[PDB]
Every structure is written in C-alpha cells, then in structure tokens.
Amino acid sequence: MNSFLKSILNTPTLTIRDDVTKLPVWKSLQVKKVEIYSPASVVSKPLATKDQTEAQVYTEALDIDVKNGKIIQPVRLRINAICPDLSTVESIMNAFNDNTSTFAITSKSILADKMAIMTLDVDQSPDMLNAAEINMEFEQVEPPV
C-alpha cells in the first residue's frame, strides 16, 4: 500500500503546464477526482438513398454522407482538489480573470491540450481549519492536428 511506487506508463500524477511557458504550475495541489467528457452530435432524421445501384457503389455512398451528420463537440474536464497554501489560490484566480490563458492537463494516460478555465469554486468550513476545497472545470479551446 506503500504508494510512491508508481507503475510506469500509468503514473497517476496530475501535471498542468502553461501553454506558452511550458513549465508546470500549481504543483501544490492534492487532487482527489478527475472526470473527462467527450460528447458529439448525431443526426436524427430519416435520410434517403437511391437503393437500386451496384452493391459497392452504394457502399461508397452511405459513407461520406454519414460524415455529414457526426461533428465532434469540445472536451470537458472536471477535477476536485484541496489547496494547502495561499500563493496557489491567487495564481489560479489571476489565471481565471485573464481572457488569454490556456493550459495542457495530463491525467494518468490522457493528454488534453489547449484548455481554459470556465468554472471555479472555493469552500471553507470547520471540516478543514487550514485548507480549502476547490472545484475547477476546463474546456478545450481548439482541436488538435
């Protein structure tokens, strides 16, 4: 149960990297949860075809057309963490107030580039007398190539 014996290829460490600086930031966090959502839209109309041609010609159709009817929407990422110190909190809020901030988040094995903070919560209570609970959400700005 030792931990700190992290297996290779799947090391569960959350690394957040500024997109222009390319140096890790907010390495003071202790994250408890990560969620990834990858939606898409699918056509919902009856659609029409010729349906009396040669078999392989019709197989060429019903492709390309299906491509017109599946278009990928952005990626949503959610995390939950506890922030121990102060400077990390103001750094996050400063990044939030900027319109021109992007980050690359790395989970156990999933890479997501060109993200941006959309939602942020902070909660303080007698359950934690020297820390605060955080709920940040990111969303992909542009798709990769």
Binding site: K6, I8, L9, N10, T11, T13, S109, L111
Partner: protein, 108 residues
C-alpha cells in the same frame, strides 16, 4: 490506396536483378512507411516542425513516468496516410534496452 519505393534494411533504393525501381503496393508499403516514420527523429523534418519522435528528450534523457514516449510513438505511427488505429503498445524497459512493441490497424 498507397505506394512507395522499396528499400532495404538500410534506407536506400533497392534494385532487383533487372534493376527496376519497384512501386510496392499497400500493406508492405504501410509497414515500410511506419518503419521509416518511427525512425525519423524530431527537429529533422524541415517545413514541418514538431514532427517525429523525441528520443533525446523523452527516452534517452532521464524521465520519471514514460507515458510521453508512448504518446509520441503512437503519434508518429499515426499521421501516416493509411493507419486507422493502434491496437497495442507495451513499452517493456526490461534490461538495459527500451523494448517497444506495436500492432496497427489499416483500412486493408
């Protein structure tokens, strides 16, 4: 749907007894293409920067996690004209070698 000129175990033009430069058809063209792609190195391709495998920054350098090597190699296996998806990547690092195995899926 692809083609290439056959090469030997060293990447030169290989000529038959007739000396004919042969246009290899699919599948083995894909194998030759992926073999050349995985060996191309990053920062060598002019007119296309950030293409290749980062051997000197991700594998040969001292590294913590070793998922970066998997991601880079999977990307270089991709970007080929014909590759559809990657079935398995193992990354053994047993012994002093850095063992890499891969199986890819094509349209054919």
């Amino acid at each position: 749907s692809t083609s290439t000129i056959r090469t030997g175990t060293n990447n030169d033009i290989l000529l038959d007894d007739n000396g004919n430069m042969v246009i290899l058809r699919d599948v083995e063209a894909c194998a030759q293409d992926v073999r050349a792609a995985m060996l191309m190195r990053t920062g060598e391709n002019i007119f296309d920067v950030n293409s290749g495998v980062g051997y000197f920054e991700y594998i040969f350098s001292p590294q913590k996690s070793y998922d970066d090597a998997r991601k880079s190699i999977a990307d270089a296996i991709l970007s080929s004209p014909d590759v559809t998806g990657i079935e398995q990547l193992d990354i053994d690092i047993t012994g002093e070698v850095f063992g890499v195995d891969a199986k890819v899926i094509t349209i054919h």
